[PDB]
Amino acid sequence: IFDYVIVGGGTAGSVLANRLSARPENRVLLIEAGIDTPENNIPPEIHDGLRPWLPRLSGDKFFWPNLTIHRAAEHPGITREPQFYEQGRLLGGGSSVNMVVSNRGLPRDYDEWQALGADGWDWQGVLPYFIKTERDADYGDDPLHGNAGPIPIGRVDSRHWSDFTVAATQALEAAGLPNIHDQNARFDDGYFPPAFTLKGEERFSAARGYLDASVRVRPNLSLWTESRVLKLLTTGNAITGVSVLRGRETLQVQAREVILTAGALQSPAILLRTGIGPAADLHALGIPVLADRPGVGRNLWEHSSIGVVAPLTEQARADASTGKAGSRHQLGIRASSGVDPATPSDLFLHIGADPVSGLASAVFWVNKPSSTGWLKLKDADPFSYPDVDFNLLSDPRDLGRLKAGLRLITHYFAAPSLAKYGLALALSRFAAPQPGGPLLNDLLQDEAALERYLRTNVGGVWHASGTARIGRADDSQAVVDKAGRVYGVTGLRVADASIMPTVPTANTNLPTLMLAEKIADAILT
Ligand SMILES: Cc1cc2nc3c(=O)[nH]c(=O)nc-3n(C[C@H](O)[C@H](O)[C@H](O)COP(=O)(O)OP(=O)(O)OC[C@H]3O[C@@H](n4cnc5c(N)ncnc54)[C@H](O)[C@@H]3O)c2cc1C
């Protein structure tokens, strides 16, 4: 019998499989529905870390195919369609397909988690784990940093910036923003070279970091790839194993404990199908209720995104071409919208220039939002995706933050060092920026039209989280405890980005690494 079966070999599942199997007495099985990414055969599209958007132009090869979601909250006089939502389907999960940025968020984010009932998940309690996971090439020996972890983090040298990037920075300086240098150990508004994870020009996923050749040869670790868990197996209120599809064949496998690291949209769907969720919803689908847990699939967080682009004039294109650090991430900006004094640093913006598409861009998202959505089952079938409604801009403060970020962009590009380029900025969808949205100067004059545009075209940033949240032991809406144990049943944990009580002011991969490090420690202790 396996001591632990870990469902989903993504960012969190890779950490857990590594940490739990470091103890030889623990017989660990890691099960991953997608392909392996062993060192001698990382797909080229995955391996190219300088072009980390490439997986998304390779169709659906590396994702859960035809996984669609509803995005913006339903709203009169706006029609919404299902949208494809990339989620990694291969060893490494999101770390194998993502944009390679590695950032922590802010102390306030984690202190809030503890305030919301996740004891020991305050900044003091998560920082050790952010240290453990990393080797920071720039600041590794400094306080608040690690120099020995499996995941490298570094930044481009400021002095390698293109002349266009420098112009952007002079605009931000005219706004009183500093260069903060290290977004992972300095927490006020400003701009910085983004911290990212690469091994030279190669992507370095959690599978390369935690499931390396030596870990893989541990006799107590088993790795099943191209193997899909369909159901959790139960004995009374105890989870006691899994059913696994391998090609055409189904296998039943016993487990002393199952740990779900199947991703924020899929871990809660598995809970629902097991009978762990809102009792009336489960009754409705004829699923016997093991535990009436109304929070399962609720509390769905994301970061709400939009873009602004402009054709590069000659001077912008020339200036954009002088960077000495290639197509690495150059510039990030942490800013405050002013919409709610409770949420400083609630916007993340990037300003940059791409000779290839011919576009300058200012893309941004609400990094500390107010809106949450939910997911529920469509039916009881193991092959169904859940019905997902991110419900973006349900809370009007998030609309307000989008408008503010657009006004900020206006302000920055009116500064002389950006104004000299004579760019004509226009709105765009965030995910694949392109022509077709209205001029920024024009839309801002039309508040009705501006709101309609945003409700129509608001995007996410693939930061789905919170659908199986940590919460207090008496909290009817909480799903797991401080060590990931699912309330109402035994033998079952969740240990992925599902468990976040709120999304941090951060891209979610590094917070995911951290929380999986922390949960592994709790298990082991
Ligand atoms: C396109 C994209 C770009 C992003 N950009 C960044 C970025 O630049 N920086 C950043 O910090 N974050 C960003 N993120 C987010 C980040 O990568 C994820 O938040 C993180 O990977 C979540 O980790 P996880 O372990 O919760 O889920 P995942 O890494 O998604 O892992 C879940 C794993 O479970 C497997 N699985 C699911 N169901 C089953 C089943 N039934 N049986 C077996 N296996 C199963 C999946 O195939 C997958 O490998 C990005 C995400 C995407 C998709």
What residues act catalytically?
Answer: 463
- Residues in a beta bridge with 260: 7, 494
Distance in angstroms (rounded) separating the CA atoms of residues 368 and 501: 13
> Any known ligand binding at 40?
no
Query: Residue 307: CB within 6 Å of ligand 1?
Result: no
Q: Give the residue extent of every domain in the chain.
A: 1-155+204-302+368-394+462-525, 156-203+303-367+395-461
Provide Rg for the chain, Cα atoms: 22
Are the CB atoms for 10 and 33 separated by under 8 Å? no
Distance in angstroms (rounded) separating the CA atoms of residues 89 and 348: 27
Query: Residue 273: CB within 6 Å of ligand 1?
Result: no
Distance in angstroms (rounded) separating the CA atoms of residues 119 and 114: 5
The residue to which tokens 């998560």 are assigned: 126
Nearest CA to ligand 1 atom 47: 89
- Tell me the technique behind this structure: X-ray
54 CA distance to ligand 1 centroid (A)? 16
Nearest CA to ligand 1 atom 46: 89
Query: Residue 260: CB within 6 Å of ligand 1?
Result: no
Tokens of 334: 């942490």
Element (H or E) spanning 3, and its range? strand 2-7
Helix, strand, coil percentages (3-state) for the chain, rounded to 5, are 30, 25, 45
List, as own/partner pairs, every contact residues 43-46 make where C-beta atoms lie below 8 angstroms and the sequence separation is at least 24, other chains included: 46/90, 46/92, 46/96, 46/97, 46/203, 46/205
Distance in angstroms (rounded) separating the CA atoms of residues 242 and 234: 9
Q: Exposed e or buried b for every residue in 37-56, given b needs 16+ CB within 10 A?
A: beeeebbebbbbbeebebbb
Q: How far is CA 215 from CA 91, 345, 511, in A?
A: 14, 39, 23
Strands of 367-515 (E only): list them: 374-376, 387-392, 426-428, 492-494
| Class for the domain spanning 156-203+303-367+395-461 | alpha beta
Q: Collapse the DSSP code of 40 into the 3-class scheme (helix H, G, I; strand E, B; otherwise coil) and give the result.
A: helix
Nearest CA to ligand 1 atom 27: 263
Residues contacting residue 488 through CB under 8 Å, at least 6 positions apart: 237, 276, 290, 291, 292, 293
* Architecture category of domain 1-155+204-302+368-394+462-525 in CATH: 3-Layer(bba) Sandwich (3.50)
Query: Residue 49: CB within 6 Å of ligand 1?
Result: no
3-state secondary structure 195-222: CECEECCEECCHHHHHCCHHHHCCCCEE
**Structure resolution, Å:** 1.6
> Any known ligand binding at 100?
yes
> Any known ligand binding at 32?
yes
